[PDB]
Structure formats: C-alpha cells, structure tokens
Design a protein around this ligand. Structure first.
Ligand SMILES: [K+]
Ligand SMILES: [Zn+2]
Length: 538
C-alpha cells in the first residue's frame, strides 16, 4: 500500500475526472514522489472545488476526515478545560457557568461541545465535506431560509467540536432597535439550542461564540449582556462554559473591558506539541536549525530582505551606507528576543551536545549568549562585510566596529551618512563593499569555514556516539531547501531511529514527510514560533 494521503488524493483526482467539474492527469502517477505539503494543498483544493453533487462514498469520507484531523493536530491546540474565566455566573448551589475570553483560531479549541459559524471558510475547510452535505439537507428539509437571529445545528464531523451553530446576524449600511434585538436573538437562539444538546462524557457543556458591518463595541456589549442575563435567568442550565472567541486585538480589548481581568489559574498539553515534548525530554543531543522565521517571530520582519540586497535606487553611496549602517545597528541592538532567551538557557543543559546551525544569521544567537564554538552560519551573517567584486579570499572585515564608528555621523531623518570617509571600500582593490551574506555569485564563504568545520566535527561525533539526537527546525522557508530542510530529512532517514525532527513554523511548509511521521521519527508544530517555544521547553 501507498499511504492514506496518496490513496485518498488519487481517488479525489479520479473523482474530478469521471464526474467532476471543470475548474490534469500527470499528478496521479508522480504523486508518490511529490512533497507531502503539496499533496495536502492539492487534496484541500479538490474538496474546495467539489461539486456537492454525487456523494463521495463512505470509506473515502472516512479517509478525508482522518487526514484533516491528523493535520489539524499539528496546530497548537487549546483544551476548553485549560482556559481561565473572566466571569462566573453562580447558579445558587446548583453549579455555575464560566465565561471566558479567548483570542485564537476557533477550530483549534478542544473538548468543546459546540462552536459558532456566521452564514464559513475555516469551519468548512476543517469540518470536511460532510458538513456541506448536512447543511444542504437540513436547509432543504426546513424549506425556509435563515432569518436574522436564527440558528441551524449540524454535527462537527472532522472538527474537534461535537456540533456547529450556524447563525445569521443583522446586516446594516446606524444600528436600529430591531437590529440590536436581532443580534441578541442570535445569542439566545444559540444557548437555547445548546441546552437541548447532549453533554460531553464528563458532564460539561461548552460553546465558542465568534463575533457575528456592525459597530464592534456595541456588538460586543450586546453579546456579553445578552449571554450574561440569559445565564442569570436560567439557574438550572446544563451549560458549563461560554467562550467569547475573538480574532483581532481590538475585539479582544472591547471584550476584555466588558468582562474584566482573567482569574488566577487554579500541564496536560495536546497535539503534536505533546509528542514533541516527549522527544525533547528523552534527547541526549539537540541540533537547532533556524531560518528567518525565528527572528521574524521576535518582531524582525514575499521578500529576501529586498531593502538591503535587492533595492538598487540609492541617491548616493552615502545614502546606501547610511541605510545599511542603520539596519545593522538596529538588528544588532534588537531588544525583544524572548524566544531566544527561553531557547538558549534550555540548550545550555546539553553542554557540548547542543549545536546551532542558522541560514539567516542576523547575529541574534550570539547576542543572546550562544557560543560561537557551537554555532554555524553557512549563508553568511551580518557580522562581516566583503568586497563586491570578491577580488580575494581575505577581502572581508568585521562589521560591528564600522557600524559603531559610523552611527554618530548618520542623519537619522534621511539615513544619510554625513561623513564620506566612513564608506567602506575594499582595502585592496578599492571597490564597493556589501554585507557578507549569500545574495549573489560574489558571495565569499571563507569567513564561515571555521563554522562549517565545527558543524562537521559535531555531527560526526554525535552520530557515531549513537546518541538520541533531536533536530528542532525553527522557521526555515522553502527558498533554499537544500541548506537545512532536506539534510534534516536526510539525517532522519539514514539514522535508524536515532535522529528525530521537530519542524516548527507558521503556514503549511511546517509539515514533515508523511512517511517519517508514520514511523514516529518526525512531527511538526504549525503556529507562531514565539508561542510554540515556551510550550515545547517549559
Ligand atoms: K466532531
Ligand atoms: Zn576587492
């Protein structure tokens, strides 16, 4: 057998033929040698352009549902029972309903009886095709359309939630009293429906409400006041938790004002994160491979730092270096580095059995205290300048002293260097200089050769001492996958289970090879590196 992903994908391509739409052939055969992430994107495309027309058969829907679920478990997951309330509605001595505020992706809440949907995109992608077919049937069978304030209940299918509440709010162009009342009816309709649904097996019952072009401050207070009174007036309610789920920071603020501070917490992690944590705690050695995504998580951010290496319309060399010196300075003094400040002390517990190899050397490893003897930078770094004609191997120089000596002489409004004697020129051919990073055929890799030698010696020793090596790959994109990503996959493949890979990043390039995940050798954590790292390493 091929994998479940390969099997399922070929039947959906096949379905797109025999009775498909027209929105070709080759992918079906070469599939087995295509990249996992690419194939999941194709599978999701096949489903998005599915004519709902002939029902997919049961066994195929089961496979689709398994895949969506397995992929969604790579996200950082939040169980309902981990949240902390901002308000408690006390039901005499009968019990209580907790009211929470939570910013995030509603499909990544776990242990949640019901979630809400307006009228679409994320919930349908994640629930799978069964949701479209149940909404279609239930809408036909009721015959009428949804009025503002009404709700349609479906199963959650491939979602972690048991049920979905699909509701229509009012629409405006200035909110009238009828529209205020329509929005409140939505919340009431949701809670009344939810009262009648079964509980989870532990007796809890929970709903995540999304924000339902209505003024956000007023919508938010109708939501909180409506839910609050309804719970006050239903002391016998079987409802135990209501989550106001915001996405934007402004909504979270509107809601936080109305609701108040979060209560005091009174581990049990989940998803690929728990597995990654196991691996990290059993490791005898750790390699960190990092790309630009790690520093982007700290606030330093399609482009290949176009400003420095691409942009080529400088009014003069004084402007060019004024900008370059200001940039090197700002990076060198970056004050917000909490992810580095958590990762580095954790790596130090490994002594000589930890190593850092980075393709986007902005210098933040060294500046948060990682030693250069356990560091590699094969695409170069901001630590050096070089001759732009690359006239000889020695035509490089440390950048830091030149940055420092130049900064007092740069007009901050125009970023113009006001002393031309500070323009760096090749001390041998006198040509222009650049930052010594791979950004063109002129790159000189000679100042990083010692780093390369340290990496070869370290790998060699760690692999031969048969150690349980974990590769934590942080924020590596897809521009040059041969530098870190493919060699990491390779070590995993060659090393007979002694090497495992945890890839962490945002977006779908965070995925690892399906077959290595199946063997328990590789997993990934898709989300913000700044969020994942404290969770992996606590
Ligand atoms: K479900
Ligand atoms: Zn030169």
């Amino acid at each position: 057998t091929a994998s479940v992903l390969d099997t399922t994908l070929t039947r959906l391509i096949d379905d797109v033929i025999e009775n498909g739409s027209s929105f070709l052939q080759h992918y079906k055969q070469h599939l087995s040698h295509l990249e996992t992430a690419s194939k999941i994107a194709l599978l999701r495309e096949c489903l998005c352009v599915r004519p709902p027309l002939p029902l997919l058969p049961e066994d195929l829907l089961q496979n689709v549902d398994s895949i969506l679920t397995r992929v969604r478990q790579h996200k950082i997951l939040t169980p309902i029972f981990s949240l902390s309330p901002s308000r408690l509605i006390k039901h005499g001595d009968l019990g209580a309903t907790r009211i929470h505020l939570w910013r995030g992706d509603i499909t990544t809440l776990t242990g949640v009886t019901a979630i809400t949907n307006a009228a679409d995109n994320i919930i349908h992608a994640e629930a799978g095709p069964r949701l479209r077919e149940e909404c279609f049937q239930r809408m036909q069978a009721r015959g009428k359309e949804l009025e503002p304030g009404e709700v349609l209940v479906t199963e959650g299918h491939a979602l972690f939630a048991s049920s979905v509440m699909h509701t229509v709010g009012p629409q405006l162009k200035s909110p009238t009293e009828t529209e205020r009342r329509q929005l409140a009816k939505c919340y009431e309709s949701i809670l009344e429906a939810l009262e009648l649904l079964p509980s989870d097996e532990d007796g809890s019952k929970s709903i995540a409400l999304c924000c339902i072009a209505f003024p956000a401050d007023e919508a938010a207070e109708i939501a909180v006041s409506t839910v609050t009174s309804w719970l006050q007036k239903h002391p016998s309610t079987t409802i135990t938790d209501v989550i106001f789920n915001t996405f934007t920071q402004s909504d979270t603020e509107f809601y936080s004002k109305l609701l108040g501070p979060s209560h005091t917490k009174s581990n049990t992690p989940q998803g690929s994160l728990s597995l990654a944590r196991e691996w990290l705690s059993s490791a005898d050695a750790v390699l960190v491979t990092a790309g630009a995504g790690l520093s982007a998580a700290e606030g330093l951010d399609l482009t290949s730092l176009y400003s420095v290496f691409g942009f080529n319309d400088w009014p003069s060399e004084e402007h060019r270096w004024g900008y370059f010196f200001t940039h090197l300075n700002m990076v060198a003094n970056w004050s917000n580095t909490p992810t580095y400040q958590t990762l580095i002390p954790w790596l130090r517990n490994f002594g000589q059995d930890a190593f850092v190899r980075t393709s986007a050397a902005d210098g933040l490893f060294l500046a948060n205290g990682w030693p250069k003897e356990q560091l590699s930078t094969p695409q170069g770094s901001y630590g050096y300048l070089q001759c732009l004609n690359n006239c000889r191997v020695d035509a490089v120089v440390p950048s830091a002293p030149l940055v420092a000596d130049a900064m007092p002489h740069i007009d901050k409004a125009t970023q113009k260097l006001m002393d031309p004697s500070k323009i760096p020129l090749c001390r041998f051919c006198g040509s222009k200089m650049s930052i010594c990073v791979r950004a063109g055929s002129w790159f000189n890799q000679a100042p990083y050769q010692e780093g390369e030698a340290q990496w070869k010696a370290w790998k060699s020793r760690v692999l031969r001492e048969k150690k349980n090596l974990v590769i934590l790959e942080l924020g590596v994109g897809m521009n040059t996958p041969g530098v870190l990503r493919w060699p990491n996959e390779d070590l995993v493949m060659r090393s007979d289970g002694r090497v495992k890979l945890i890839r962490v990043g945002m977006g779908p390039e965070a995925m690892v090879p399906w077959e290595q995940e199946d063997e328990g050798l590789s997993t990934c954590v898709q989300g913000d590196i700044g969020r994942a790292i404290p969770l992996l390493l606590e």
